[PDB]
Design an enzyme around this catalytic site. Structure first.
Site, PDB file in Angstrom:
ATOM      1  N   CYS B 205       0.878  -1.159   0.000  1.00  0.00           N
ATOM      2  CA  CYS B 205       0.000   0.000   0.000  1.00  0.00           C
ATOM      3  C   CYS B 205       0.928   1.224   0.000  1.00  0.00           C
ATOM      4  O   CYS B 205       2.014   1.176   0.592  1.00  0.00           O
ATOM      5  CB  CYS B 205      -0.935  -0.032   1.215  1.00  0.00           C
ATOM      6  N   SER B 424      -6.676   9.940   0.866  1.00  0.00           N
ATOM      7  CA  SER B 424      -6.437   8.686   1.569  1.00  0.00           C
ATOM      8  C   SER B 424      -6.927   8.662   3.007  1.00  0.00           C
ATOM      9  O   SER B 424      -6.620   9.553   3.799  1.00  0.00           O
ATOM     10  CB  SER B 424      -4.940   8.341   1.543  1.00  0.00           C
TER      11      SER B 424
END
Ligand code: MN
Lengths: 528, 518
Positions: B205, B424
């Site tokens: 990620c 995010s």
């Protein structure tokens, strides 16, 4: 060498009989032998993971029924949902309805018709179950990494919540039922429910014996596999109006016949009327007019009415003896009785009102459901009657009806969202509804579609807000409430097992890794 | 196929591709291969995939946003219920690899975001949502047409055909894998896909640590392979390039000179190679923290630096006259050159070879120490641009200044480059930014050219939040929780789904049955 063959057989038969004498099975009737089961087996026995969960579910429901309490849950869509449900609910329900709109094995959605491929609901079971197993490993790794004195603040979630799954009507004939059952057991089902409707189809039921055969097929497949899988029998007789065929005498009390001898048979009529161009809601009005004219009734009522209106003496006397001799008997024997008590054959035509598909008219309702429930009882671990509305009085009546014959029979109940828990109920009654029902023996309850509706609701709320105030909506409606309520998932790398897998890789590579996901500057350090 | 013509079919199809490639869709697109090469990879059963319609629509949307310096914004979608509700308000859909890892692996084995699920995973999710979009679009057309025009005003008129952008991770292997994955995405329904310059096998990620990049050329090759496969299939599929250079600290190999300015080397000639130390430590039983400390202080002693910085340091410290002059001339002649060529320049200017060793600090896997940051990211993005339709740089925080710095960097060279931005939830937004700025962040980023923005994990977190909230309350006050927390807010906000039989298409299919029966 066939010496051994026979000894291996006998020993395994003995092992199955021992298993069958276990208290798990004390309410269970098997219409087949251990010898027949074992001779269907091969030579590589498997103890399926789902068996552990079946055994867990059995203890739970046994516990609940004994204390007249209930386990209750709802239909789970996917793994995120299931990891949160695991905190507060001790079982998981997988819904055929939700699967049809949300999880068809061929990705083609649509309404609840059980016309997805039959892999669909078992795949969803495997979906959730495999996720449960993962989070269970994840959590054991996290807890064991510190000494037990430092574990008090660590999560201790039971992820291994037994799954009960929708088997619809079995997706075909008996061999399909067995293959479907097989899939379920290998995918992770602790229990399944199967309902007495006819596949591919007012609801249409199958004869009582046909559903009984379905239940036996489920048990047999479970036995072959060595699984304690629970079987739940559902009846749709409460609102059903149709019956696929009439060969089961236990159904005859609820099959409606025409008592009007002037009428031409309905199918012959509709066929002729469709040729004449006539169609749409005008055919449907013909059918409704015909049915109304036919004065539908059971044979027993038709006999009693004929007695009330004919030339007979001691009319109460003839009736009570007809009841004494004919009730609960086949139609063929009820007719013989009636002919001998009345001196003639009264008019009763149950073929005439049949639908274009050949379905018989059924007198559905709570009585019909009880009659079916009692016959299913020794072939299932729990019984469920589909409910039109949350009617406590009716739930009491069904429970009493079943318990008068089988006082130990576990019951299941659908707390359905197709209801309107507002117009159907005030707030304090809502708060106690599950508990009250539990008193009657409804020990496992569920909201079929709550997974659907919670997702629909949050998605509509967030997307709307998101499209209006942008990123503020995320902080305000999602992330900050996650933080304040200490939701698991807010630290999503940890929750997803990032630490679990770093530790895995370090184990194989000398206790360190240059590429550890949770090292260095993971931005999860922004979360306390 | 009959010969005699064969060439004729080939040459007519080639012309059709050349005509296609001249469309303004491709005006920023570099293809290092020819139409003749593409057509000769095709068969004789051409297909126009349904995803192509979506790609064209997505392209039209993003062109409009960029040209007006606005943004389309969306978030990562889990499953069909969600997508039918998103459709009302958001004109695109994101399919997340992160979300797929935890909730949708094709093998049902979940896990953290490492792209170690079967690569069928994210395409299957694309198909999952797309087949549902198609279905509800059918459901709605039947519903609206079943009444006459003058009384449709109150009916739902939702656009379910929102173009999907999907996560291709790093491409799941070599170039032939990248092309097979691209092919899946196209046949499953993707309007566009994103692919990042990490190594598969190590992929993280963007907000995980331990990120390893691949050479600039390798990611370029991935992008060209995506385009080639789209070209073979006749799709206008968008390709989004993501760089993880802002925070990455490692590099898989050093073969590409465009990377050399960002590769850190040891400047300490007293040290043995780190790996040789590690091998001896392990071979005699050392492990774990003890092994990590050996690495940690070896790296400290090595005084890591770029070669350019080592040359400047050696000039500053050595016996040289006109040090500002040699620095001027060194920088000039060595900039953007391979290490080999820059070493030659330094030897000529200095009269001797300074010590510099970037092999020596390599990890046990052979990875190089990388000097990551926004500059490294701009460098990669500038190289990626002719091969992708939008660029995205991961960051550690929702930082407007860096977002601007990145946009300025790219636009200095490619002023018309579409950018994309990850809103995010790996960020703690409450601490990263005041609420008044949160409300304007998207609009402000759009002014810089961030014309497509997405909250990667909102699907996950929305589902997680409402599930924790309802299951808890349900466990305590039973059905009251359902009326209070779910059913009545649904009725109140007029959610579609509350009439679940209709929403699911019961009327649609009922009408189908009536059609094929009577
Ligand atoms: Mn991703």
């Amino acid at each position: 060498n066939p010496d051994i063959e026979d000894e291996l057989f006998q020993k395994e038969v003995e092992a199955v009989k021992t298993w069958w004498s276990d208290s798990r099975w004390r309410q269970t009737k098997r219409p087949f032998t251990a010898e027949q089961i074992v001779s269907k087996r091969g030579y590589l026995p498997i103890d399926y993971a789902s068996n552990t969960q079946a055994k867990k579910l059995w203890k739970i429901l046994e516990h609940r029924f004994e204390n007249r309490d209930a386990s209750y849950t709802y239909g789970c869509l996917e793994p995120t949902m299931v990891t949160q449900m695991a905190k507060y609910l001790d079982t998981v329900y997988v819904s055929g309805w939700q699967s049809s709109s949300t999880a068809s094995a061929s990705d083609e959605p649509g309404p609840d018709l059980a016309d997805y491929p039959y892999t669909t609901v078992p795949n969803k079971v495997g979906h959730l179950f495999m996720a449960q197993l993962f989070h269970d490993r994840k959590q054991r790794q996290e807890r064991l990494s510190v000494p037990k004195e430092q574990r008090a603040n660590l999560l201790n979630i039971d992820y291994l919540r037994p799954i009960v799954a929708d088997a619809d009507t079995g997706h075909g004939g008996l061999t399909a039922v067995m293959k479907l059952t097989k899939l379920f057991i290998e995918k992770g089902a602790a229990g399944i429910h199967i309902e007495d409707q006819a596949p591919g189809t007012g609801k249409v039921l199958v004869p009582i014996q046909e559903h009984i055969n379905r239940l036996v097929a489920i048990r047999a497949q479970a036995d072959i596999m060595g699984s304690d899988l629970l079987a739940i029998a559902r009846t749709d007789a409460e609102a059903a109006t149709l019956l696929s065929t009439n060969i089961d005498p236990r159904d005859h009390a609820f099959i409606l016949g025409s008592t009007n001898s002037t009428l031409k048979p309905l199918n012959d009529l509709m066929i002729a009327a469709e040729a004449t161009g006539k169609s749409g809601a005008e055919l449907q009005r013909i059918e409704d007019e015909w049915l109304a004219k036919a004065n539908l009734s059971s044979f027993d009522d038709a006999v009693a009415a004929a007695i009330d209106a004919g030339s007979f003496s001691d009319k109460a006397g003839i009736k009570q003896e007809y009841t004494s001799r004919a009730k609960g008997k086949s139609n063929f024997e009820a007719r013989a009785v009636a002919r001998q008590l009345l001196g003639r054959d009264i008019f009763f035509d149950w073929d005439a009102p049949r639908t274009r598909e050949g379905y018989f008219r059924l007198k559905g309702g709570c009585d019909c459901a009880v009659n079916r429930a009692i016959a299913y009882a020794p072939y299932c671990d729990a019984i469920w009657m589909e409910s039109k509305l949350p009617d406590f009085a009716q739930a009491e009546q069904f429970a009493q009806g079943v318990h008068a014959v089988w006082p130990e029979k576990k019951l299941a109940y659908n707390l359905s969202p197709s209801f309107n828990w507002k117009t159907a109920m005030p707030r304090d009654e809502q708060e106690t509804y599950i508990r009250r029902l539990a008193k009657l023996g409804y020990c496992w309850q569920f909201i079929t579609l709550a997974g659907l509706h919670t997702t629909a609701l949050i998605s509509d709320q967030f997307a709307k807000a998101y499209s209006t105030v942008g990123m503020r909506a995320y902080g305000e409606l999602v992330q900050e409430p996650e933080m304040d309520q200490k939701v698991d998932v807010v630290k999503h790398q940890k929750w997803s097992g990032a630490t679990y897998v770093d530790e895995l890789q370090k184990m194989v590579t000398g206790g360190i890794s240059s590429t550890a996901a949770m090292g260095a500057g993971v931005t999860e350090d922004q979360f306390k």
